[PDB]
Design a protein around this ligand. Structure first.
Ligand SMILES: O=C(O)Cc1ccc(O)c(O)c1
Ligand SMILES: O=C(O)Cc1ccc(O)c(O)c1
Ligand SMILES: [Ca+2]
Ligand SMILES: [Cl-]
Ligand SMILES: [Cl-]
Ligand SMILES: [Fe+2]
Ligand SMILES: [Fe+2]
Ligand SMILES: [Fe+2]
Ligand SMILES: [Fe+2]
Lengths: 361, 359, 357, 356
């Protein structure tokens, strides 16, 4: 059921800014994000770790908060002015959503902040005020071979992609690419404020769940190094998918799994989307170069597994099942189909994945 | 067992070129020149002679039109003219068929010996070759995917220790191999030129040619070949990869030519030229041995390979492997692999890694 | 003399979009930009070549226009809406600047467009409407080892940097980085709309002149390849400066010279500036890591040479002399000084450039 | 000329390590370990032993505390234990001073011969060495600037042809050199291991050690060294580069340690292992021979180099080059260079390139 456009003006959103993830063992999670991935510690204590990327000047891009149930607690967007936090509150109230306003922040290093249970069941935060820290962008004495330089985007699993898409468009996100079929189904969409392919993205599936948080690197070899290091640490089982070239976004990518199975994407070298008539690219769901441009098969966990999300009380949001067709099922499932060249039987796949693989039992 | 000759082994420098029989010369040319960017040393209606960016000998690859795609010769350069005579005496003592041509079998090679070796493979040994313009600083020509050297061959043969011993007598030194705990050898890598490999043995029905490998300068050059193949909408000819190898530590990719000949693109293995270079043995169930990142080995990699010819140009008969199959013991329905030895977490039973089973 | 802030609202400027460069030999220029640099032809004829980068979808990033005097004819910024072109027109009219509007464009592939002689003497164009073309961002069948992927920025030589900076700020550009000394002089400033370090930048010097136009690559090796190719073509003398790591911007860079001596920068991997309180970085002019972070010396030509610019009638703009201190003189001239570590005599340079020259 | 011994030459595999005397061990450690990321094989209060990422022999660099910074030994590994005996006979026949230590001069080397060679350089030959963990897949340790192998040495010596013929007799093959039309040789590069160089000769006053070179995997690893040096505010210790070489075709950088020992970082030269590997001669006036992009060579690169020690640890006396100077004929007041031979456009007279 369609989400109405409020009369109240949308807040002016700059970018994705940070996620707060609940984690079950804080020391194990620190080992992953600090020792394996090289994120920089802005603050920590016995309950939380606050981490930032190489080029960041706001207080953090990631808060790890200890709790009993691993989940997304908030995805936070920075807004352009303090007054945009008021606009966000009015906007979401008009939408009939539950909201919570804290003048001195939910997490350290953030000031006046609004959290909301959005119409798709996701916990969004909007804030302007944040504690500036040392921007480490020229600290090459600290630079790692796998350095994560920026927070890039979030990706959300939600059952009805068009419903979500219209709501985000009204909030001022522009869709850059999407995946559809010839029968009216949308499987995924990507949308931005900051002028890259994405600040958030919708993946069709049971939800609300958080698919991933993405960080970028400077160069492709930096992503290769993360893989290499995970091999040396004998944690290659935590590399879920990749590395690859995306069709959607044209980025070089890797997906890995934190100790609570929160999925992290490492990403580089997408393209500029800031013009308001930026061409929207629609890929057909059966095109086997859409997700991995080289045609490598998409691991089934990538479609089925995602993180729980919390409501404003800290309880897990109940999952609503997708009734639209499943991307997994129509591409690599038993009645699935994919092609390399449209209309060519050669290099097509019927009821199995590419490259000689089938879905595991 | 293959006996060690009394005659001295030829001093082999390196792998030098392969002659591949191809069925459609123009389609093969499109692949090797237009897609992969190899440099033409000579061509006519019957053959295309190709070299890599840094080569100075006449060629690294000869594509010969013929009725049945196959490997016709894998050629090693020897240190001196006299080493061709040494190769001839050596293989005659082994009781192999040999053929000697004072003026070469292909253009740009002089005095050369071809043999049907004890494993059924057509080896060539030569010294003399026509030098060409070494293109190593021709950055006006350099591709985003530039292939810079010929690196190695890889041969499929049923009995790896038997082949390994024979190659050792020939002066190749084993760098890495893959074994299990009950004494089966699945693969071995061996060199002359001070890299991980000049040729390599993969256990399987043979003789078949598994692949020919070319290097690039950097990892991104390999990524570009993938990217270009997607743009050309030939991603279905990317067989496996890209990845980081366990064995060799090289960054890699496997692609298939129009006759299904497999080409590896490879970079950044390590120096093995010291005589006590430490050998590395990997367990066959170690899921990081082939792809260090644990990505699954596609089953065609284990099953498919090119035919090889005898000196008459007929296809060599295949002999079946009786030792255990790497595919079966790792990714088949009774297969298993681990991430950490002894740890059930990150182990895979009856399927491949990353959530796939065999198609 | 301070440029006043209009009552009229500023246009919403998205980004630098294209430059129109007058060149004297269209074929020689084509050889440089297409054959050497690999830019993509959107359109050409006997008078003009329209070129774009690998990831662009608007008609072009660079127009080469044959003419008698090599010069910048227009530096063009795209605005957010058609109504922003009206805003630009009112804004510059209130500034008392000469303006010209053409509903059907000045160059092919651009629709309704306003050109102005701006208060610093530069020919700015603002436009929204443009013909979309095939975006080549996944055409890896065409991708060059030196591929130029985006237009990034322009850099302008102007005698009074503070005066220009205030005007650009009023127009909506935000200063990301600058170079000053301890005596109240500003030598350079960088400023943006699109959320990178720069869409345009001001270099203190006699002006108006165009210092350079900059294009991006994906990776540092792509810039190295441009140098390697120029060596192979035996045109290494057209490499002016670099490659290097910038202090200001933190980008990896290269400066080369086209056949009419128009300077092109190749640039990669600066940082995100889109937050409105993005911290502004000020360097001291004597800091020998401010321009090349590795302390490589800046050749004098980089400071003294720059392209002519045209007025709306196509005539060369008269050059006004800088009276503020010269960055060349104070760092590498006879009485110049630079340091590696502030306050350390070791690694400092008196009356000469770094690294032995 | 240095006569060829009748005794057989030792079979030399490769350059293996250098022993550098340093004046302040902790400062040197900071440079080679904390800045450059070399891996500790052993240390104590007098010495630090260091290796590159892909090495399995005990070390590639030994830093020894001493009163005067100098090269103490440049060591080549030989193929067999018997090659040490061959090296001893060979240098004895040459009339050179030698010292054999059956248990080595430095830790992790066994039976070793040091010699004061005919050019005044302290060479070591050894086979026996303690194997260590080869770190080539320890990506948990890998630095953004990782030094992966020892590549070569470069020696300053007054008479390049004399040194070249000596090295050829020892089995080194020349790959590239720089000459002029009058017949002067200014520099030569020569190898055993099938790369462009294991050692190289630069014309100048000598014996002095010009540099020791380490390789990286990729060009960005070299860029990272420069960026790191910037961040550490020691950019003044970047001497020359980064660049593409003409000779060798390698991507390069030169930096200076705390005692002004020069280290090259190098990647992506070409294969030279075939015995008829084509030799490349550049003209000294060709401005792309050293830096392919035509960037000027700073005078310090031609004039400055490290002292070397004799076997008593005293500094070797230096012999002045009497052949023409490459500095003088290219960038000095009467020098010149060209971009394109015969073209005055892109030529530099009495001046280096690019405006200096
Ligand atoms: O299959 C793997 O990944 C192991 C391996 C290593 C080096 C090679 O050259 C090769 O062809 C295969
Ligand atoms: O000076 C130059 O640039 C030539 C050169 C090539 C290879 C080397 O290893 C070296 O030290 C110097
Ligand atoms: Ca359908
Ligand atoms: Cl995807
Ligand atoms: Cl600069
Ligand atoms: Fe993503
Ligand atoms: Fe291989
Ligand atoms: Fe610039
Ligand atoms: Fe060197």
């Amino acid at each position: 059921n369609e989400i109405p456009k409020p009369v109240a003006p949308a807040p002016d959103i700059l970018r994705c800014a940070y996620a707060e993830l609940v984690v079950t063992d804080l020391a194990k999670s620190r080992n992953f994000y600090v020792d394996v991935l090289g994120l920089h510690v802005s603050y920590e204590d016995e309950n939380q770790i606050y981490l930032r990327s190489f080029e960041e000047f706001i207080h953090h891009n990631l808060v790890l908060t200890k709790g009993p149930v691993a989940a997304l607690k908030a995805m936070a967007f920075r807004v352009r002015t303090p007054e945009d936090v008021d606009k966000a509150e009015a906007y979401y109230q008009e939408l009939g959503c539950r909201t919570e306003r804290r003048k001195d922040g939910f997490v350290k290093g953030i000031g006046d902040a609004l959290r909301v249970e959005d119409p798709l069941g996701f916990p969004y935060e909007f804030f302007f005020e944040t504690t500036h820290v040392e921007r480490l962008h020229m600290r090459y004495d600290l630079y790692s071979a796998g350095e994560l330089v920026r927070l890039d985007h979030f990706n959300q699993v939600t059952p009805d992609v068009p419903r979500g898409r219209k709501y985000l468009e009204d909030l001022g996100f522009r869709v850059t690419e999407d995946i559809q079929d010839d029968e009216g189904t949308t499987y995924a969409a990507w949308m931005h404020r900051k002028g890259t392919v994405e600040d958030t993205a919708l993946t069709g599936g049971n939800g609300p769940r958080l698919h991933h948080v993405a960080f970028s690197t400077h160069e492709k070899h930096n992503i290769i190094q993360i893989c290499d290091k995970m091999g040396a640490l004998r944690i290659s089982d935590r590399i879920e998918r990749g590395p690859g070239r995306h069709g959607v976004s044209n980025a070089f990518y890797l997906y890995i799994l934190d100790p609570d199975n929160h999925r992290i994407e490492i990403y580089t070298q997408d393209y500029y989307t800031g013009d308001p008539d930026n061409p929207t690219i629609t890929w057909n769901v059966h095109d086997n170069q859409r997700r991995d441009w080289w045609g490598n098969p998409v691991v089934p966990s990538w479609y089925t597994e995602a993180s729980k999300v919390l409501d404003l009380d800290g309880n897990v949001q109940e999952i609503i099942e997708r009734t639209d067709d499943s991307e997994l099922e129509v591409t690599i499932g038993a009645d699935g189909f994919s092609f390399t060249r449209a209309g060519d039987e050669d290099g097509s796949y019927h009821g199995q994945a590419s490259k000689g693989f089938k879905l595991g039992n």
